[PDB]
């Protein structure tokens, strides 16, 4: 939803490229921070963020 | 770097009727419209209120 709302904090883009730049970055933000606490649990100020 | 965004541009004109000021404080002079994600970074760990 963090890549999803920033796509919808654009207007929304039916150009189908920004559909695709959504998805290939939608899959990237998930692979990075799904399990964020415990993966970044000791990092203070990232859990604050 | 924020002290280069602040104090790069020359001030235009002393307009009298526009007086945005602090609460019992000095008149305001800058704007700094940012995005919502950068607001949660500068105000988090670089600036005061």
XYZ file of N, CA and C in Angstrom:
294
model
N 0.820 -1.200 0.000
C 0.000 0.000 0.000
C 0.858 1.257 0.000
N 2.059 1.196 0.578
C 2.972 2.330 0.439
C 3.364 2.639 -1.001
N 3.668 1.679 -1.888
C 3.734 2.063 -3.301
C 2.373 2.305 -3.913
N 1.316 1.745 -3.333
C 0.005 1.877 -3.947
C -0.587 3.261 -3.715
N -0.399 3.832 -2.522
C -0.983 5.147 -2.271
C -0.148 6.254 -2.877
N 1.164 6.051 -3.008
C 1.974 7.075 -3.655
C 1.705 7.101 -5.153
N 1.282 5.970 -5.715
C 0.722 5.975 -7.061
C -0.624 6.680 -7.090
N -1.393 6.579 -6.007
C -2.683 7.258 -5.980
C -2.594 8.578 -5.226
N -1.375 9.006 -4.880
C -1.121 10.404 -4.522
C -0.507 11.104 -5.737
N -0.462 10.355 -6.835
C -0.624 10.942 -8.156
C -2.129 10.939 -8.383
N -2.556 11.310 -9.584
C -3.982 11.253 -9.847
C -4.471 9.824 -9.940
N -4.120 9.160 -11.032
C -3.923 7.736 -11.253
C -3.538 7.746 -12.711
N -2.757 6.794 -13.167
C -2.212 6.897 -14.505
C -2.613 5.670 -15.299
N -3.532 5.860 -16.237
C -4.006 4.781 -17.081
C -3.154 4.615 -18.322
N -1.882 5.003 -18.255
C -1.010 4.908 -19.415
C -0.428 3.516 -19.568
N -0.640 2.646 -18.574
C -0.247 1.234 -18.529
C 1.271 1.066 -18.378
N 2.043 2.131 -18.570
C 3.432 2.105 -18.142
C 3.508 2.343 -16.651
N 2.775 3.340 -16.162
C 2.762 3.581 -14.727
C 1.949 2.526 -13.989
N 1.144 1.747 -14.708
C 0.697 0.478 -14.154
C 1.877 -0.458 -13.970
N 2.757 -0.529 -14.967
C 3.861 -1.477 -14.893
C 4.964 -0.980 -13.966
N 5.194 0.336 -13.906
C 6.181 0.842 -12.955
C 5.644 0.792 -11.544
N 4.324 0.715 -11.397
C 3.772 0.385 -10.097
C 4.191 -1.012 -9.689
N 3.918 -1.997 -10.552
C 3.994 -3.407 -10.170
C 5.433 -3.832 -9.925
N 6.344 -3.450 -10.820
C 7.738 -3.858 -10.670
C 8.418 -3.101 -9.541
N 7.735 -2.100 -8.990
C 8.165 -1.488 -7.747
C 7.257 -1.919 -6.602
N 6.048 -2.389 -6.921
C 5.197 -2.990 -5.896
C 5.798 -4.292 -5.405
N 6.421 -5.047 -6.304
C 7.066 -6.285 -5.898
C 8.390 -6.012 -5.204
N 8.931 -4.810 -5.376
C 10.237 -4.523 -4.804
C 10.110 -4.070 -3.363
N 9.109 -3.238 -3.069
C 8.932 -2.764 -1.701
C 8.490 -3.891 -0.784
N 7.800 -4.888 -1.335
C 7.399 -6.031 -0.528
C 8.605 -6.879 -0.163
N 9.459 -7.168 -1.147
C 10.631 -8.009 -0.921
C 11.616 -7.335 0.019
N 11.564 -6.011 0.098
C 12.457 -5.292 0.988
C 11.904 -5.270 2.406
N 10.755 -4.625 2.612
C 10.212 -4.460 3.956
C 8.842 -5.099 4.028
N 8.806 -6.416 4.166
C 7.565 -7.065 4.553
C 7.595 -7.234 6.058
N 8.669 -7.848 6.547
C 8.864 -8.289 7.919
C 9.665 -7.301 8.738
N 9.393 -6.004 8.587
C 10.323 -4.917 8.873
C 10.829 -4.885 10.306
N 9.947 -5.070 11.278
C 10.374 -5.206 12.663
C 10.933 -6.608 12.850
N 12.059 -6.717 13.541
C 12.825 -7.933 13.566
C 13.868 -7.995 12.471
N 13.519 -7.550 11.266
C 14.520 -7.354 10.226
C 15.260 -6.048 10.444
N 14.541 -5.017 10.862
C 15.095 -3.723 11.226
C 14.655 -3.350 12.626
N 14.640 -4.330 13.526
C 14.121 -4.080 14.858
C 15.077 -3.283 15.720
N 16.379 -3.522 15.569
C 17.339 -2.809 16.401
C 17.562 -1.397 15.889
N 17.294 -1.163 14.607
C 17.441 0.176 14.061
C 16.321 1.075 14.556
N 16.624 1.859 15.577
C 15.760 2.939 16.015
C 15.765 3.994 14.916
N 14.678 4.776 14.839
C 14.393 5.857 13.884
C 14.058 5.341 12.490
N 14.209 4.038 12.257
C 13.576 3.425 11.098
C 12.244 2.820 11.502
N 12.158 2.341 12.742
C 10.881 1.914 13.299
C 10.039 3.129 13.668
N 10.688 4.223 14.072
C 9.981 5.493 14.208
C 9.422 5.954 12.871
N 10.150 5.702 11.785
C 9.631 6.042 10.467
C 8.624 5.008 9.997
N 22.590 22.028 3.541
C 21.810 22.042 2.313
C 20.500 22.783 2.495
N 19.867 22.642 3.660
C 18.675 23.435 3.941
C 19.004 24.899 4.150
N 20.249 25.211 4.506
C 20.644 26.609 4.618
C 21.100 27.128 3.255
N 20.916 26.322 2.205
C 21.050 26.844 0.851
C 19.704 26.966 0.156
N 18.716 26.154 0.539
C 17.367 26.448 0.064
C 16.843 27.728 0.674
N 16.831 27.809 1.991
C 16.753 29.074 2.692
C 18.006 29.860 2.336
N 17.840 31.147 2.040
C 18.856 32.125 1.652
C 19.559 31.766 0.350
N 18.826 31.433 -0.711
C 19.404 31.538 -2.045
C 18.775 32.686 -2.818
N 17.459 32.803 -2.747
C 16.703 33.737 -3.554
C 16.603 35.082 -2.858
N 16.736 36.139 -3.636
C 16.576 37.471 -3.096
C 15.109 37.771 -2.819
N 14.812 38.418 -1.689
C 13.424 38.767 -1.346
C 12.875 39.811 -2.309
N 11.576 39.733 -2.597
C 11.022 40.569 -3.655
C 10.700 41.970 -3.170
N 9.696 42.101 -2.306
C 9.176 43.412 -1.942
C 8.518 43.297 -0.575
N 8.675 44.334 0.237
C 8.050 44.413 1.545
C 6.590 44.789 1.348
N 5.712 43.795 1.375
C 4.286 44.048 1.221
C 3.687 44.215 2.618
N 2.933 45.287 2.867
C 2.500 45.552 4.246
C 1.342 44.695 4.703
N 0.328 44.512 3.859
C -0.916 43.917 4.332
C -0.784 42.413 4.512
N 0.217 41.803 3.880
C 0.483 40.381 4.074
C 1.491 40.230 5.211
N 0.976 39.864 6.376
C 1.814 39.634 7.547
C 1.463 38.309 8.220
N 2.024 37.226 7.702
C 2.004 35.945 8.384
C 3.149 35.936 9.376
N 2.822 35.739 10.645
C 3.814 35.802 11.700
C 3.669 34.591 12.598
N 4.658 34.414 13.464
C 4.566 33.394 14.491
C 3.578 33.827 15.562
N 3.179 32.876 16.394
C 2.345 33.219 17.529
C 3.161 34.012 18.550
N 2.883 35.323 18.596
C 3.660 36.317 19.347
C 5.140 36.245 18.987
N 5.428 36.333 17.690
C 6.770 36.113 17.205
C 7.026 36.890 15.932
N 8.062 36.465 15.220
C 8.557 37.241 14.097
C 7.705 36.973 12.860
N 7.687 37.885 11.892
C 6.983 37.609 10.637
C 7.681 36.530 9.824
N 6.874 35.663 9.221
C 7.345 34.505 8.477
C 7.788 35.010 7.113
N 8.751 34.328 6.486
C 9.230 34.758 5.178
C 9.391 33.638 4.151
N 9.554 32.388 4.570
C 9.693 31.309 3.608
C 8.430 30.475 3.494
N 8.463 29.459 2.616
C 7.332 28.550 2.410
C 7.727 27.090 2.578
N 8.630 26.596 1.725
C 9.075 25.194 1.696
C 7.941 24.181 1.585
N 7.244 24.181 0.453
C 6.344 23.076 0.163
C 7.161 21.869 -0.266
N 7.011 20.770 0.466
C 7.734 19.538 0.189
C 6.704 18.451 -0.046
N 7.183 17.233 -0.254
C 6.255 16.115 -0.276
C 6.054 15.570 1.129
N 5.093 14.659 1.263
C 4.731 14.167 2.586
C 5.786 13.217 3.137
N 6.544 12.570 2.255
C 7.552 11.625 2.716
C 8.796 12.349 3.213
N 9.137 13.475 2.586
C 10.308 14.234 3.013
C 10.006 14.990 4.301
N 8.734 15.348 4.506
C 8.315 16.006 5.742
C 8.528 15.106 6.951
N 8.427 13.792 6.755
C 8.600 12.853 7.858
C 10.064 12.493 8.049
N 10.955 13.203 7.370
C 12.374 12.926 7.518
C 13.104 14.128 8.096
N 12.823 15.317 7.565
C 13.477 16.524 8.060
C 12.953 16.892 9.434
N 11.638 16.812 9.608
C 11.034 17.193 10.875
C 11.262 16.108 11.915
N 11.588 14.899 11.456
C 11.867 13.793 12.363
C 13.233 13.931 13.008
N 14.261 14.207 12.214
C 15.623 14.115 12.702
C 16.545 15.232 12.240
N 16.019 16.355 11.753
C 16.879 17.462 11.365
C 16.387 18.825 11.833
N 15.098 19.000 12.106
C 14.604 20.343 12.371
C 13.748 20.376 13.623
N 13.479 21.601 14.070
C 12.680 21.872 15.250
C 11.324 22.394 14.815
N 10.504 22.758 15.797
C 9.139 23.215 15.558
C 8.913 24.481 16.381
